[PDB]
Design a protein around this ligand. Structure first.
Ligand code: NA
Ligand code: NA
Ligand code: NA
Ligand code: NA
Ligand code: NA
Lengths: 119, 119
Protein backbone atom coordinates (compact mmCIF):
# COMPACT_ATOMS: atom_id res chain seq x y z
CA UNK A 1 0.00 0.00 0.00
CA UNK A 2 3.09 2.20 -0.41
CA UNK A 3 3.57 1.44 -4.14
CA UNK A 4 2.53 4.66 -5.86
CA UNK A 5 3.29 3.84 -9.52
CA UNK A 6 4.14 0.80 -11.63
CA UNK A 7 7.75 0.53 -12.82
CA UNK A 8 8.26 -1.56 -16.00
CA UNK A 9 10.37 -4.58 -15.22
CA UNK A 10 13.13 -3.70 -17.71
CA UNK A 11 13.72 -0.36 -15.94
CA UNK A 12 13.76 -2.09 -12.55
CA UNK A 13 16.51 -4.39 -13.81
CA UNK A 14 18.35 -1.52 -15.50
CA UNK A 15 18.14 0.40 -12.21
CA UNK A 16 19.44 -2.54 -10.18
CA UNK A 17 22.34 -3.11 -12.59
CA UNK A 18 23.35 0.55 -12.30
CA UNK A 19 23.15 0.37 -8.50
CA UNK A 20 25.58 -2.58 -8.50
CA UNK A 21 27.96 -0.55 -10.68
CA UNK A 22 27.72 2.67 -8.62
CA UNK A 23 29.16 0.91 -5.55
CA UNK A 24 32.75 0.71 -6.80
CA UNK A 25 32.77 4.18 -8.33
CA UNK A 26 30.48 6.10 -6.00
CA UNK A 27 28.60 6.09 -2.69
CA UNK A 28 25.39 4.28 -1.70
CA UNK A 29 23.48 4.61 1.56
CA UNK A 30 21.93 1.31 2.65
CA UNK A 31 18.83 0.87 4.76
CA UNK A 32 15.78 2.93 5.51
CA UNK A 33 17.12 5.25 8.22
CA UNK A 34 20.18 6.25 6.17
CA UNK A 35 18.11 6.55 3.00
CA UNK A 36 15.65 8.80 4.86
CA UNK A 37 18.47 11.00 6.16
CA UNK A 38 19.99 11.28 2.68
CA UNK A 39 16.60 12.35 1.27
CA UNK A 40 16.12 14.86 4.08
CA UNK A 41 19.58 16.31 3.45
CA UNK A 42 18.98 16.58 -0.30
CA UNK A 43 21.95 14.32 -1.05
CA UNK A 44 19.94 11.39 -2.46
CA UNK A 45 20.24 11.32 -6.25
CA UNK A 46 18.08 8.21 -6.67
CA UNK A 47 16.19 6.16 -4.05
CA UNK A 48 15.41 2.44 -4.29
CA UNK A 49 12.47 0.86 -2.43
CA UNK A 50 11.66 -2.85 -2.46
CA UNK A 51 7.99 -3.77 -2.96
CA UNK A 52 8.06 -6.71 -0.50
CA UNK A 53 9.48 -5.08 2.65
CA UNK A 54 8.44 -6.68 5.96
CA UNK A 55 6.73 -4.81 7.60
CA UNK A 56 5.62 -2.52 4.75
CA UNK A 57 5.10 0.26 7.30
CA UNK A 58 8.86 0.81 7.70
CA UNK A 59 9.12 2.31 4.19
CA UNK A 60 5.63 3.84 3.95
CA UNK A 61 7.02 7.33 4.64
CA UNK A 62 9.67 7.15 1.92
CA UNK A 63 7.80 7.79 -1.38
CA UNK A 64 6.00 10.69 0.25
CA UNK A 65 9.23 12.20 1.60
CA UNK A 66 10.97 11.70 -1.76
CA UNK A 67 8.13 13.51 -3.54
CA UNK A 68 8.32 16.37 -1.03
CA UNK A 69 12.08 16.69 -1.53
CA UNK A 70 11.97 16.27 -5.33
CA UNK A 71 14.16 13.15 -5.03
CA UNK A 72 13.65 10.52 -7.78
CA UNK A 73 12.77 7.05 -6.51
CA UNK A 74 12.03 3.70 -8.09
CA UNK A 75 10.38 0.53 -6.82
CA UNK A 76 12.05 -2.83 -7.32
CA UNK A 77 10.03 -6.00 -6.80
CA UNK A 78 12.44 -7.97 -4.60
CA UNK A 79 14.27 -6.91 -1.44
CA UNK A 80 16.54 -9.90 -2.04
CA UNK A 81 17.54 -8.41 -5.40
CA UNK A 82 18.07 -5.00 -3.77
CA UNK A 83 20.34 -6.45 -1.10
CA UNK A 84 22.44 -8.23 -3.72
CA UNK A 85 22.66 -5.02 -5.72
CA UNK A 86 24.10 -3.14 -2.71
CA UNK A 87 26.58 -5.98 -2.27
CA UNK A 88 25.01 -8.05 0.50
CA UNK A 89 23.83 -11.68 0.80
CA UNK A 90 20.78 -10.60 2.86
CA UNK A 91 17.79 -8.45 1.80
CA UNK A 92 17.70 -4.69 1.60
CA UNK A 93 14.51 -2.67 2.08
CA UNK A 94 15.73 0.62 0.62
CA UNK A 95 18.89 2.39 -0.55
CA UNK A 96 20.02 5.75 -1.92
CA UNK A 97 22.68 6.60 -4.46
CA UNK A 98 24.57 9.58 -2.97
CA UNK A 99 27.51 9.86 -5.39
CA UNK A 100 27.32 8.30 -8.84
CA UNK A 101 31.09 8.32 -9.34
CA UNK A 102 31.86 7.76 -13.02
CA UNK A 103 28.23 6.88 -13.89
CA UNK A 104 26.91 10.44 -14.12
CA UNK A 105 25.44 10.16 -17.62
CA UNK A 106 23.99 6.68 -17.06
CA UNK A 107 22.32 7.79 -13.82
CA UNK A 108 21.12 10.91 -15.62
CA UNK A 109 19.41 8.91 -18.36
CA UNK A 110 17.80 6.53 -15.86
CA UNK A 111 16.49 9.44 -13.78
CA UNK A 112 15.03 11.05 -16.90
CA UNK A 113 13.42 7.70 -17.75
CA UNK A 114 11.89 7.41 -14.28
CA UNK A 115 10.64 10.99 -14.53
CA UNK A 116 8.89 10.14 -17.80
CA UNK A 117 6.90 7.32 -16.21
CA UNK A 118 3.18 7.85 -15.74
CA UNK A 119 2.45 8.65 -12.10
CA UNK B 1 21.23 12.19 25.33
CA UNK B 2 17.43 12.61 25.09
CA UNK B 3 16.17 9.54 26.98
CA UNK B 4 12.93 9.71 25.08
CA UNK B 5 11.16 6.78 26.76
CA UNK B 6 11.68 8.19 30.26
CA UNK B 7 9.95 11.54 29.80
CA UNK B 8 8.10 12.31 33.06
CA UNK B 9 4.43 11.35 33.03
CA UNK B 10 3.36 14.83 34.17
CA UNK B 11 5.18 16.29 31.14
CA UNK B 12 3.47 13.82 28.79
CA UNK B 13 0.12 14.69 30.30
CA UNK B 14 0.76 18.44 30.20
CA UNK B 15 1.59 17.88 26.51
CA UNK B 16 -1.64 15.95 25.85
CA UNK B 17 -3.68 18.63 27.62
CA UNK B 18 -2.05 21.32 25.48
CA UNK B 19 -2.68 19.39 22.26
CA UNK B 20 -6.38 18.97 23.06
CA UNK B 21 -6.75 22.67 23.85
CA UNK B 22 -4.76 23.84 20.80
CA UNK B 23 -7.18 22.08 18.44
CA UNK B 24 -9.62 24.88 19.31
CA UNK B 25 -7.53 28.04 18.79
CA UNK B 26 -4.54 26.85 16.78
CA UNK B 27 -3.53 24.39 14.06
CA UNK B 28 -2.62 20.71 14.44
CA UNK B 29 -1.72 17.83 12.14
CA UNK B 30 -3.51 14.65 13.20
CA UNK B 31 -1.80 11.91 11.16
CA UNK B 32 1.64 10.48 10.54
CA UNK B 33 1.91 11.54 6.89
CA UNK B 34 0.84 15.13 7.61
CA UNK B 35 3.05 15.28 10.70
CA UNK B 36 6.00 14.05 8.59
CA UNK B 37 5.46 16.77 5.98
CA UNK B 38 5.22 19.41 8.71
CA UNK B 39 8.55 18.24 10.19
CA UNK B 40 10.19 18.21 6.76
CA UNK B 41 8.95 21.76 6.15
CA UNK B 42 10.17 23.02 9.53
CA UNK B 43 6.58 23.91 10.47
CA UNK B 44 6.09 21.49 13.38
CA UNK B 45 6.53 23.25 16.71
CA UNK B 46 6.04 20.03 18.70
CA UNK B 47 5.60 16.43 17.54
CA UNK B 48 3.76 13.73 19.48
CA UNK B 49 4.40 10.00 19.05
CA UNK B 50 2.50 7.20 20.79
CA UNK B 51 4.72 4.54 22.35
CA UNK B 52 2.26 1.68 21.74
CA UNK B 53 1.46 2.21 18.04
CA UNK B 54 1.11 -1.08 16.16
CA UNK B 55 3.39 -1.48 14.33
CA UNK B 56 6.05 0.81 15.83
CA UNK B 57 7.69 0.88 12.39
CA UNK B 58 5.05 3.30 11.05
CA UNK B 59 6.49 6.15 13.18
CA UNK B 60 10.14 5.00 13.42
CA UNK B 61 11.28 7.74 11.00
CA UNK B 62 9.83 10.53 13.17
CA UNK B 63 12.48 10.71 15.95
CA UNK B 64 15.10 10.54 13.21
CA UNK B 65 13.65 13.46 11.25
CA UNK B 66 12.82 15.54 14.32
CA UNK B 67 16.41 15.37 15.58
CA UNK B 68 17.61 16.09 12.04
CA UNK B 69 15.36 19.18 11.77
CA UNK B 70 15.69 20.41 15.40
CA UNK B 71 11.97 19.78 16.05
CA UNK B 72 10.99 19.02 19.67
CA UNK B 73 9.16 15.71 20.04
CA UNK B 74 7.65 13.74 22.91
CA UNK B 75 6.60 10.11 23.25
CA UNK B 76 3.35 9.56 25.10
CA UNK B 77 2.51 6.25 26.74
CA UNK B 78 -0.86 5.62 25.09
CA UNK B 79 -2.11 5.90 21.53
CA UNK B 80 -5.61 6.09 23.00
CA UNK B 81 -4.69 9.20 25.01
CA UNK B 82 -3.15 10.74 21.89
CA UNK B 83 -6.20 9.94 19.76
CA UNK B 84 -8.52 11.51 22.32
CA UNK B 85 -6.31 14.62 22.46
CA UNK B 86 -6.63 15.16 18.68
CA UNK B 87 -10.30 14.12 18.57
CA UNK B 88 -9.83 10.89 16.62
CA UNK B 89 -12.24 8.00 16.97
CA UNK B 90 -9.37 5.60 16.34
CA UNK B 91 -5.97 5.50 18.09
CA UNK B 92 -3.42 8.06 17.04
CA UNK B 93 0.12 7.28 15.96
CA UNK B 94 1.55 10.80 15.82
CA UNK B 95 0.53 14.44 15.62
CA UNK B 96 2.06 17.89 15.53
CA UNK B 97 1.33 21.39 16.71
CA UNK B 98 1.72 23.88 13.84
CA UNK B 99 0.29 26.94 15.59
CA UNK B 100 -0.62 27.14 19.27
CA UNK B 101 -3.10 30.00 18.78
CA UNK B 102 -3.75 31.61 22.17
CA UNK B 103 -1.77 28.97 24.14
CA UNK B 104 1.62 30.78 23.68
CA UNK B 105 2.41 30.43 27.40
CA UNK B 106 1.64 26.74 27.48
CA UNK B 107 3.44 25.75 24.29
CA UNK B 108 6.46 27.89 25.16
CA UNK B 109 6.86 26.48 28.68
CA UNK B 110 6.34 22.88 27.54
CA UNK B 111 8.87 23.16 24.69
CA UNK B 112 11.46 24.58 27.08
CA UNK B 113 10.87 21.72 29.54
CA UNK B 114 11.31 19.18 26.72
CA UNK B 115 14.56 20.85 25.62
CA UNK B 116 15.68 20.65 29.25
CA UNK B 117 15.65 16.86 28.88
CA UNK B 118 18.48 17.00 26.31
CA UNK B 119 22.26 17.45 26.27
NA1 NA C 1 11.60 -7.41 -19.10
NA1 NA D 1 17.78 -2.78 5.15
NA1 NA E 1 23.41 11.59 4.12
NA1 NA F 1 2.70 21.36 6.78
NA1 NA G 1 12.92 16.17 5.66
Amino acid sequence: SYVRFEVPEDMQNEALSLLEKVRESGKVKKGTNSTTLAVSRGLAKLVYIAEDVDPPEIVAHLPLLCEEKNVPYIYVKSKNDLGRAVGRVYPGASAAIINEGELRKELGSLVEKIKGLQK
